[PDB]
Design an enzyme around this catalytic site. Structure first.
Site, PDB file in Angstrom:
ATOM      1  N   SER A 105      33.931 -85.158 -13.649  1.00 48.09           N
ATOM      2  CA  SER A 105      35.084 -84.865 -12.789  1.00 48.09           C
ATOM      3  C   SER A 105      34.660 -83.840 -11.746  1.00 48.09           C
ATOM      4  O   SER A 105      33.688 -84.099 -11.015  1.00 48.09           O
ATOM      5  CB  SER A 105      36.267 -84.456 -13.668  1.00 48.09           C
ATOM      6  OG  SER A 105      36.812 -85.573 -14.352  1.00 48.09           O
TER       7      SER A 105
ATOM      8  N   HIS B 156      40.019 -92.953 -16.471  1.00 47.63           N
ATOM      9  CA  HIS B 156      39.733 -91.534 -16.309  1.00 47.63           C
ATOM     10  C   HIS B 156      38.774 -91.026 -17.378  1.00 47.63           C
ATOM     11  O   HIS B 156      38.542 -89.815 -17.464  1.00 47.63           O
ATOM     12  CB  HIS B 156      41.032 -90.721 -16.343  1.00 47.63           C
ATOM     13  CG  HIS B 156      41.724 -90.741 -17.672  1.00 47.63           C
ATOM     14  ND1 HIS B 156      42.793 -91.567 -17.941  1.00 47.63           N
ATOM     15  CD2 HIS B 156      41.498 -90.038 -18.807  1.00 47.63           C
ATOM     16  CE1 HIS B 156      43.196 -91.374 -19.185  1.00 47.63           C
ATOM     17  NE2 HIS B 156      42.426 -90.450 -19.732  1.00 47.63           N
TER      18      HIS B 156
ATOM     19  N   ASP C  37      38.434 -95.415 -10.071  1.00 41.57           N
ATOM     20  CA  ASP C  37      38.668 -94.134 -10.727  1.00 41.57           C
ATOM     21  C   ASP C  37      40.113 -93.684 -10.541  1.00 41.57           C
ATOM     22  O   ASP C  37      40.663 -93.756  -9.438  1.00 41.57           O
ATOM     23  CB  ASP C  37      37.702 -93.090 -10.165  1.00 41.57           C
ATOM     24  CG  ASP C  37      37.786 -91.764 -10.887  1.00 41.57           C
ATOM     25  OD1 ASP C  37      37.135 -91.616 -11.943  1.00 41.57           O
ATOM     26  OD2 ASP C  37      38.496 -90.866 -10.393  1.00 41.57           O
TER      27      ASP C  37
HETATM   28  O1  LIG Z   1      39.789 -84.429 -12.746  1.00 36.38           O
HETATM   29  C1  LIG Z   1      39.776 -85.256 -11.617  1.00 36.38           C
HETATM   30  C2  LIG Z   1      39.186 -84.468 -10.449  1.00 36.38           C
HETATM   31  C3  LIG Z   1      38.819 -84.980  -9.217  1.00 36.38           C
HETATM   32  N1  LIG Z   1      38.357 -83.983  -8.480  1.00 36.38           N
HETATM   33  C4  LIG Z   1      37.895 -84.075  -7.246  1.00 36.38           C
HETATM   34  C5  LIG Z   1      36.776 -83.345  -6.883  1.00 36.38           C
HETATM   35  C6  LIG Z   1      36.269 -83.438  -5.597  1.00 36.38           C
HETATM   36  C7  LIG Z   1      36.883 -84.268  -4.674  1.00 36.38           C
HETATM   37 CL1  LIG Z   1      36.232 -84.389  -3.016  1.00 36.38          CL
HETATM   38  C8  LIG Z   1      37.999 -85.003  -5.037  1.00 36.38           C
HETATM   39 CL2  LIG Z   1      38.785 -86.071  -3.842  1.00 36.38          CL
HETATM   40  C9  LIG Z   1      38.506 -84.910  -6.324  1.00 36.38           C
HETATM   41  N2  LIG Z   1      38.416 -82.844  -9.228  1.00 36.38           N
HETATM   42  N3  LIG Z   1      38.937 -83.172 -10.444  1.00 36.38           N
END
Ligand SMILES: OCc1cn(-c2ccc(Cl)c(Cl)c2)nn1
Ligand SMILES: *[C@@H]1O[C@H](CO)[C@@H](O)[C@H](O)[C@H]1NC(C)=O
EC number: 3.1.1.98
Length: 353
Positions: free
Chosen positions: A145, A299, A253
């Site tokens: 994640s 997920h 995702d």
């Molecule tokens: O747990 C799910 C999650 C997704 N992200 C996340 C991290 C970086 C980016 Cl650039 C985006 Cl779009 C989402 N951080 N946590």
């Protein structure tokens, strides 16, 4: 079980100033080390960091951490559950900086919160060298994640640090799980007026300023000042990296669909959107030689106990990672590039239930 160690350098802290740390299980007969980065979104201003501190405090503070944790999935020590690296030294690094592992700012008279994700990783490495990491042959920096994105942001700095500390024989590699996101059009569009409506590119842009975030220099030199948010997106930062990186990413995702404002009887407009998303992700992995990308809506994450069950073209992730190991000493019947080509969620029968 993995045992908790708080960092002896107490200037390296979680969001609220409490010391960061790591969980460790040593394997005296191994020169393999696996350092795993926890995930769990982020916060980028005062209002939504205060809200995270109320109901997600373990991701912002160490004061309530337990003394031990059980290793699961790729962090398991039983070969039955982890055919890949069951005998390696295991390290679990809690995510208590809410900065996608990029920050380098302390709590002070001008900062309510400390964002020290990048410095947390470097201090864990430094203190582990005295724990036997000095004798390692491979250091695998993995994460899921926000921790998967953190692998992409930090793997070359870890290799950099070990060279200047005098350990050039340690091979540093990366494994990025569910952290390969796209800055695409949302299915329904909202202007950045609050936390809910702010698209990732806007939120990351403000986060870097709020965190004093840092990105790999080669990526920094391409995009330059004001535009470093580009380096949080895997398909843009991956070609700038020198360390070998294995990429794991569902084609559909759930976190990607969340920031695209998709919440699942699908009509034509949404069907084309979902099908186009799968295509675009497949396209960005086309020049990624080590990758695992099943066509699932999920997920789930590589520290889950049943991570061995999913297969792409008949090959599991633990086998693909073993093939990757061999390729870093093409291989007959032991592939490393595994991207599904079918266009809809769960067209792969082995998708998680
Ligand atoms: O747990 C799910 C999650 C997704 N992200 C996340 C991290 C970086 C980016 Cl650039 C985006 Cl779009 C989402 N951080 N946590
Ligand atoms: C503690 O960590 C800080 C921040 O990374 C660093 O600047 C400092 O040199 C460290 N202190 C010691 C004694 O290692």
């Amino acid at each position: 079980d993995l045992r908790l160690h708080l960092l002896l350098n107490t200037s390296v802290t979680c969001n609220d100033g409490s010391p960061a740390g790591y969980y460790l299980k040593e394997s005296r007969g191994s020169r393999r080390w696996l350092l795993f980065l926890e995930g769990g979104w982020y916060c980028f201003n005062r209002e939504n960091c205060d809200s995270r501190y109320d109901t997600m405090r373990r991701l912002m503070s160490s004061r309530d951490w337990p003394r031990t944790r059980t290793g699961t999935g790729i962090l398991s020590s039983q070969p039955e559950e982890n055919p890949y690296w069951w005998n390696a030294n295991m390290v679990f690094i809690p995510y208590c900086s809410s900065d996608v592992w990029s920050g380098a700012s302390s709590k002070s008279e001008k900062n309510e919160y400390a964002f020290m994700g990048a410095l947390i990783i470097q201090e864990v490495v430094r203190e582990l060298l005295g724990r036997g990491l000095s004798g390692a042959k491979v250091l695998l920096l993995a994460g899921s994640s926000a921790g998967g994105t953190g692998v992409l942001l930090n793997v070359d700095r870890v290799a950099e640090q070990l060279e200047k500390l005098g350990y050039p024989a340690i091979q540093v590699r990366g494994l990025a799980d569910s952290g390969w996101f796209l800055d695409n059009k949302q299915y329904r569009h909202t202007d950045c007026v609050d936390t809910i409506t702010c698209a990732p590119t806007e939120a990351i842009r403000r986060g870097i300023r709020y965190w004093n975030g840092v990105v790999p220099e080669r990526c920094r030199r391409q995009f330059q000042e004001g535009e470093e948010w580009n380096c949080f997106f895997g398909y843009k930062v991956y070609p700038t990296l020198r360390s070998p990186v294995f990429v794991v990413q569902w084609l559909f995702d759930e976190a990607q669909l969340t920031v695209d404002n998709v919440h699942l009887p699908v009509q034509e407009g949404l069907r084309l959107y979902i099908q186009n998303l799968g295509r675009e992700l497949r396209h960005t992995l086309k020049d990624v030689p080590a990758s695992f990308a099943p066509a699932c809506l999920s997920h789930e994450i590589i520290i889950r106990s049943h991570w061995t069950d999913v297969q792409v073209k008949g090959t599991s992730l633990p086998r693909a990672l073993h093939c990757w190991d061999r390729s870093l000493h093409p291989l007959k019947g032991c592939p490393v590039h595994l991207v599904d080509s079918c266009p809809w969620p769960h067209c792969n029968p082995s998708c998680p239930t």
